Write a protein that binds this ligand. Structure first.
Ligand SMILES: CCCCCCCCCCCCCCCCCC(=O)OC[C@H](COP(=O)([O-])OCC(O)COP(=O)([O-])OC[C@@H](COC(=O)CCCCCCCCCCCCCCCCC)OC(=O)CCCCCCCCCCCCCCCCC)OC(=O)CCCCCCCCCCCCCCCCC
Ligand code: SF4
Ligand code: SF4
Ligand code: SF4
Lengths: 53, 94, 318, 172, 152, 112, 269, 176
């Protein structure tokens, strides 16, 4: 949170997972089937609108 | 052993509730057929039974009857009908 | 009036397969803690007359990209081999008496999967294309688990007909003696007819919706009424091939009464599962058949062969 | 339901073939078989042989063909077609169909024409049975189970299959 | 003469009494849809069975926020549905867009993309004014298919 | 003579019921636009179906285990004989000729 | 259907069976946020932090309201914080009731959903009684909690907590050692590397993978220091040892909610 | 501190390994739970039978709007233009203009009911204590031409129940 010294802010930059836990799908899953990749995601707990990051 | 035990509440839930007439009629409105203990006064046609304080959240219930205000008869029941008092009662806000 | 004994069968059954769909979600309702279709009935028992009528009013699209000649002969089946298979099935008196007829089921158990391969191919691309291909592949590998473990017991009863199979289970409920097999007679029909724990054919999880995806309300009642015309039959079979009733040459009627109070318990098993278990990820799905289910089924066959011969037991038939 | 219910099957059978004996875009090839196989297992179920008929459904028509149909998605043709639509397929058809018809027309359309087609009478199934009999499982192929006398017939077939897989474990 | 208008106490009572709603999860509003099919307020078994495939549905439901890149997807899905179709938006973001209504990458309103029928108003509508919004749509079939064939 | 009366009865309800469902509203006066919007949720999909092998073998692999369990079928009729030893000694061969044919291939199923 | 209450489109080039490639397209929900929070004041722009995720509510804003009190050199009064542990550590009972279930609705089961959300309701009251609304509730602020809580809730928190460790014992006999599930997950998607750090992952898919670190006890928040808890850890880096944190991490919380009802001192808010 | 999970080794002795070979091959586990922990159906269902019974709430609940008035009515709103200026979503719209006597009041007051994000920022900025989020979820009409409200929709909607509202604040106002 930058702030410029007065009332309204300046960049407010939010980071939540979903730039990591899903940066690492492509890596993680190579070499297992397709019917795994549905059950890989569920463990990171990816929930979107958060990737509004 | 359990065939006549619980059964003695239901046969008194039927034969002592409206006989055959006042039973099938309160079942056809919904399957809520359990007869609460007490009653309530208000207001037009719509009672409030209230259970014995033996449940939480299904302990406080209501009954709709007929043609409140320029209304279709019965099988239309929505739930915006309750008088703007019971929102302080039926909703368990207080 | 032999033609009015038939049409008294086809009609009165289409009510069960209809009113199963209701007891579908009541029984599976109270597993969840809730009530089942309620508002419309009054009890709900009136739901399925309203549901049969919404589909055939609702417009039946065809894909612009389809081959219409196959998009008919295929479903014009999913309702035959489901309603033909019922024919020689004693309760107690079957409509037909087929000499070797037990074998005749496998004839009609084998010829339905050749109505899946048509439809999913008849239409179009990869959700019903390779998606109706690889439900072929599992459906034929659960026969070899089957015909053997059907053929086992038939060493223990003497022939291929069904009038003998009431005689031998007299006072012995044929489930004692082979109880190891009986298990595998169950997981088969549940794996073959595409039901809960091995669910893949009809899609929910692994894909969008398997094999049903294209048919709009118009044809899709048939399949949704076909797929439930197998499930209440294999399960109206198992209980003539295992849990036997006691024929009565006098009050035939008390045979069926006690007979539907079994086959109708038994069925309520594919509903009592579906609330419970998850799915198999198609590798594990066949990969558990050859390795695991099969070696036994051969081994037991080397056993029920000798057990009669080694006890002077040999059952009285040709 | 006359006495001709056999002759009416075969001439559907004989017409079962010529569908796929020309050139139909072989996803309809199957539908030239399972009719032919079906009516074929139809004819055999007369004459008293039964078990041996009801197997063709199980071992071949039911079981085999599906493999013939489980491929032709691997060899998959490009954009299939309704046969007899074309001018390439349709031309070859009829002349077959008429060739038995024009045969079947005056084969016997009259007293006799002439000799080679005249020594086959019709209509009572003159031969189709003999007398009466007793019963063994039926009489005929009711006893098709010989693990008695037949042995050197099995043990070749028993052994010839076991090699069926080894060959095919390789080239695959 | 009168048989028609008595017939529409069947067909106009059939289509209203069995609905096969699609849903769109997108944004916050999806969770207060789930709790309509959780056992408290029990959506199904009050006549409406929950999600099916795109082809078999009747009433699609829009939750959530509709950005640019989702519009080309919706429009297409709304089509394929059979005839007797409706569109019931919900949430303060299918009505003119919650907030984000001034953003750059949010379509403003989701009426603009399709002919929407019933509305519901607020971040999450309280899982109640949902069902209250349907017992509008089961009462919004008073219509008659008589008096098109049978007048003009 | 009453079997075929019990078959063509069955289809003719089914081959009826296609038209009274598929066809009847199919000529109804609703819109039914010809737009190429159909073939759901894989919009275009232009390819041949490629050969994928472990799809294939599970065809062949069965077809052969299938045969002999037609050969194996007439045991329960053959349990009634004169000399029976030529049965038990012989009957048990087919099975082990089946089970062997597993064990070999069992080194490689691949992903089946 | 497998969107997990969201809308992603991923594209894979699989090799005949195995995937070996994936490259998802996110950006379906963007909505244009951080361009719109330069245009709003500090207390006016709070909710757009609550509406970010759908599940954790008071745990967001605990991370904004702590990034403002700093620049102001100001701390809440003592009864402030000991709320923000009771709600702050009650919503860890939400995302761990969801990510064991609405994950395992993909695996296909039914009941472990229709069995739980009977209960995840009994919690949503406690957002409604305390302040207003069903889910998103704007309560925490730059100054500590908004307004005091009614006379009550401490016989509805206690009464509810001592019932709860049973429910979490109906997601155990129904899952852990049930085989068809054990086999759907073991040794699946294993990242054990020091890439599982190099990418800068956060908590679980860390702490369940070995490398041992957490930001609750290595840094204080708001009095978090004065209560005792143990951070479950995993054996091998697969999934089924990232599940097993999220059970033994719902059985730690009921320690703190039980430890934090005894200490709340009277004071302003 | 720490803990270590899934760190264990099998015992490897023939008193044990039967106990793990009486498990794989006899299914002695996997019938333990879902032979049982499933049934365990014999508990009373939990359902709020909806059209009639309804569930709990609290006096601080949020929902449909109102504008009160004192005893004999003043339209309690003074149009001080605040509940407008703290509004995150910017739903509110207010236009004052001096009423005939010279006391000021409103003319147009419009809460859009789609944009309103249900803060509880417009209940808490009004110093004269007019505008109040009601506790009734009555909603869901069939046309978006509607939910936009005018002034003279609100007042009624806030004089339809004031027996609901006027008895909540006097539970809640002692805290804040
Ligand atoms: C019809 C539905 C309407 C209805 O039943 O009335 C509601 C009426 C209201 O009771 P309730 O308010 O629901 O009380 C529920 C109890 O709290 C909870 O009820 P419950 O858990 O006690 O269930 C009662 C019973 C239900 O089982 C029965 O159906 C009783 C058998 C009846 C035989 C006649 O279940 C059993 O316990 C079976 C015991 C059988 C004996 C087993 C002992 C042998 C051991 C061998 C060693 O209940 C009954 O009438 C019960 C009779 C059920 C009749 C079903 C139809 C007849 C068959
Ligand atoms: S408020 Fe806007 S974002 Fe939050 S749920 Fe309702 S619509 Fe989705
Ligand atoms: S209520 Fe308070 S804020 Fe809303 S207008 Fe009247 S005075 Fe201004
Ligand atoms: S209710 Fe919430 S949104 Fe609507 S005005 Fe008051 S504060 Fe702004």
């Amino acid at each position: 949170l930058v702030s410029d010294g007065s009332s309204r802010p300046y960049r407010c930059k939010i980071k939540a997972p979903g730039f990591a836990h899903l940066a690492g799908l492509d890596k993680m899953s190579k070499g297992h089937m397709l019917a795994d990749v549905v059950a890989i995601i569920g463990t990171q707990d990816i929930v979107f609108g958060e990737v509004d990051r | 052993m359990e065939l006549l035990q619980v059964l003695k509440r239901g046969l008194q839930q039927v034969s002592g509730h409206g006989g055959l007439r006042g039973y099938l009629r309160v079942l056809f409105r919904a399957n809520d057929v359990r007869v609460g203990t007490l009653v309530g006064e208000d207001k037009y046609g719509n009672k409030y039974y209230e259970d014995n304080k033996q449940f939480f959240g299904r302990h406080r219930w209501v009954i709709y009857t007929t043609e409140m205000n320029g209304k279709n008869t019965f099988w239309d029941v929505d739930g915006s009908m309750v008088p703007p008092e019971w929102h302080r009662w039926l909703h368990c806000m207080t | 009036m032999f033609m009015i004994n038939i049409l008294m069968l086809i009609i009165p059954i289409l009510l069960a397969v209809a009113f199963l769909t209701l007891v579908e979600r009541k029984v599976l309702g109270y597993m969840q803690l809730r009530k089942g279709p309620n508002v419309v009935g009054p009890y709900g028992l009136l739901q399925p007359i309203a549901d049969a009528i919404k589909l055939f009013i609702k417009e039946p699209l065809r894909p612009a990209t389809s081959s219409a000649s196959m998009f008919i002969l295929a479903p014009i089946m999913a309702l035959g081999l489901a309603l033909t298979m019922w024919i020689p099935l004693p309760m107690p008196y079957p409509l037909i008496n087929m000499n070797l007829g037990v074998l005749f089921m496998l004839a009609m158990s084998s010829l339905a999967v050749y109505s899946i391969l048509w439809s999913g191919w008849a239409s179009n691309s990869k959700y019903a294309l390779i998606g109706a291909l690889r439900a072929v592949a599992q459906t034929i590998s659960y026969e070899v688990t089957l015909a053997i473990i059907l053929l086992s017991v038939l060493l223990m009863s003497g022939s291929f007909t069904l009038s003998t199979l009431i005689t031998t289970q007299e006072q012995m409920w044929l489930i004692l003696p082979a109880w190891p097999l009986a298990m595998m007679w169950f997981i088969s029909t549940l794996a073959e007819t595409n039901r809960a724990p091995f669910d893949l054919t009809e899609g929910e999880s692994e894909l969008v919706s398997g094999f049903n995806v294209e048919y709009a309300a118009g044809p899709f009642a048939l399949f949704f009424m076909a797929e439930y015309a197998n499930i209440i039959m294999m399960n109206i079979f198992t209980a003539i091939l295992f849990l036997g009733t006691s024929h009565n040459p006098h009050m035939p009627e008390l045979y069926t009464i006690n007979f539907t109070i079994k086959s109708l318990l038994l069925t309520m098993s594919f509903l009592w599962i579906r609330a419970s278990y998850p799915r198999f990820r198609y590798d594990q799905l066949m990969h558990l058949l050859w390795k695991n289910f099969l070696p036994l089924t051969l081994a037991l066959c080397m056993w029920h062969v000798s057990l009669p011969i080694l006890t002077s037991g040999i059952p009285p038939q040709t | 339901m006359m006495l001709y219910i056999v002759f009416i099957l075969s001439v559907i059978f004989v017409m079962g073939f010529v569908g796929f004996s020309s050139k139909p875009s072989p996803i309809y090839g199957g539908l030239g078989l399972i009719v032919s196989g079906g009516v074929g297992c139809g004819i055999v179920l007369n004459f008293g042989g039964s078990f041996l008929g009801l197997m063709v459904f199980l071992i071949y028509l039911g079981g085999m063909m599906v493999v013939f149909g489980y491929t032709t998605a691997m060899a998959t043709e490009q954009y299939p077609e309704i046969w007899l639509s074309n001018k390439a397929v349709l031309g070859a058809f009829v002349t077959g169909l008429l060739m038995e018809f024009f045969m079947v027309y005056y084969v016997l359309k009259d007293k006799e024409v002439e000799v080679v087609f005249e020594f086959n009478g019709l209509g009572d199934w003159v031969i189709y049975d003999t007398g009466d009999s007793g019963f063994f499982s039926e009489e005929a192929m009711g006893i098709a189970a010989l693990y008695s006398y037949g042995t050197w017939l099995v043990i070749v077939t028993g052994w010839s299959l076991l090699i069926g897989v080894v060959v095919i474990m390789e080239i695959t | 003469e009168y048989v028609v208008a008595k017939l529409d106490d069947l067909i106009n009572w059939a289509r209203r009494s069995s609905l096969w709603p699609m849903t769109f999860g997108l944004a916050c509003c999806a969770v207060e849809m789930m709790h309509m099919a959780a056992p408290r307020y029990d959506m199904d078994r009050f006549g409406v069975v929950f999600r099916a495939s795109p082809r078999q549905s009747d009433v699609m439901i829009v939750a959530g926020t509709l950005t640019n890149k989702m519009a080309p997807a919706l429009r297409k899905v709304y089509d394929q549905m059979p005839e007797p179709r409706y569109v019931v938006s919900m949430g303060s973001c299918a009505n003119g867009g919650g907030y984000y209504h001034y953003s750059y990458s949010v379509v403003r309103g989701c009426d603009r993309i399709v002919p929407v029928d019933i509305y519901v108003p607020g971040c999450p509508p309280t899982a109640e004014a949902l069902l209250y919004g349907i017992l509008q749509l089961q009462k919004k079939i008073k219509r008659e298919k008589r008096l098109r064939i049978w007048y003009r | 003579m009453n079997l075929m009366l019990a078959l063509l009865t069955n289809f003719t309800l089914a081959t009826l019921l296609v038209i009274i469902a598929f066809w009847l509203p199919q000529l109804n006066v609703y819109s039914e636009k010809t737009s190429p919007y159909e073939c759901g949720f894989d919009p275009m999909g232009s390819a041949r179906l490629p050969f994928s092998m472990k799809f294939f073998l599970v065809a062949i692999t069965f077809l052969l285990f299938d045969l002999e369990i037609a050969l194996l079928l007439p045991l329960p009729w053959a349990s009634q004989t004169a000399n029976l030893n030529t049965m038990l000694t012989m009957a048990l061969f087919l099975i082990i000729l089946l089970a062997v044919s597993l064990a070999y291939e069992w080194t490689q199923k691949g992903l089946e | 259907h497998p969107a997990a209450h969201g809308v992603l489109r991923l594209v894979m080039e699989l090799s005949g069976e195995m995937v070996r490639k994936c490259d998802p397209h996110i950006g379906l929900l963007h909505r244009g946020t951080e361009k719109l929070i330069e245009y709003k004041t500090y207390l006016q722009a709070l909710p757009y932090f609550d509406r970010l995720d759908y599940v954790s509510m008071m745990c967001n804003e605990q991370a904004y309201s702590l990034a403002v009190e700093k620049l102001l050199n100001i701390q809440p009064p003592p009864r402030a914080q000991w709320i923000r542990v009771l709600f702050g550590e009650i919503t860890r009972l939400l995302n761990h009731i969801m990510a064991v279930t609405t994950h395992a609705l993909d695996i296909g089961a039914m009941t472990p959903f229709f069995w739980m959300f009977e209960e995840r309701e009994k919690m949503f009251e406690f957002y409604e009684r305390v302040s207003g609304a069903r889910m998103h509730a704007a309560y925490v602020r730059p100054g500590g909690v908004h307004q005091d809580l009614p006379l009550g809730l401490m016989d509805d928190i206690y009464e509810f907590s001592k019932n709860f460790s049973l429910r979490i014992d109906e997601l155990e006999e129904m899952l852990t050692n049930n085989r068809i599930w054990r086999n759907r997950t073991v040794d699946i998607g294993i990242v054990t590397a020091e890439d599982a750090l190099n990418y800068g992952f956060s908590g679980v898919m860390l702490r369940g993978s070995g490398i041992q670190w957490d930001l609750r006890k290595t840094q204080p928040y708001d009095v978090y220091d004065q209560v005792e808890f143990d951070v479950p850890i995993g054996s091998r880096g697969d999934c089924y040892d990232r599940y097993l944190c999220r059970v033994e991490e719902m059985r730690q919380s009921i320690r703190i909610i039980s430890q934090c009802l005894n200490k709340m001192p009277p004071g302003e808010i | 501190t720490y803990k270590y999970v899934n760190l264990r080794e099998p015992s490897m002795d023939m008193k044990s390994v039967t106990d793990r070979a009486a498990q794989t091959l006899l299914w002695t586990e996997l019938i333990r739970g879902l032979g049982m922990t499933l049934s365990y159906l014999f508990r009373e269902p939990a359902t709020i039978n909806y059209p009639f019974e309804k569930g709990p709430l609290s006096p601080r609940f949020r929902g449909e709007h109102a504008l009160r008035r004192y005893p004999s009515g003043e339209e309690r709103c003074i149009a001080c233009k605040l509940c407008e200026a703290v509004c995150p979503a910017q739903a509110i719209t207010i236009e004052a203009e001096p009423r005939a006597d010279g006391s000021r009041r409103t003319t147009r007051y419009d809460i859009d009911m789609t944009k309103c994000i249900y803060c509880g920022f417009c209940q808490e900025a009004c110093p004269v204590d007019a505008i109040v989020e009601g506790p009734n979820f009555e909603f869901s009409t069939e046309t978006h031409e509607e939910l936009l409200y005018n002034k003279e929709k609100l007042l009624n909607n806030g004089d339809k129940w004031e027996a609901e509202i006027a008895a909540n604040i006097q539970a809640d106002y002692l805290y804040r």
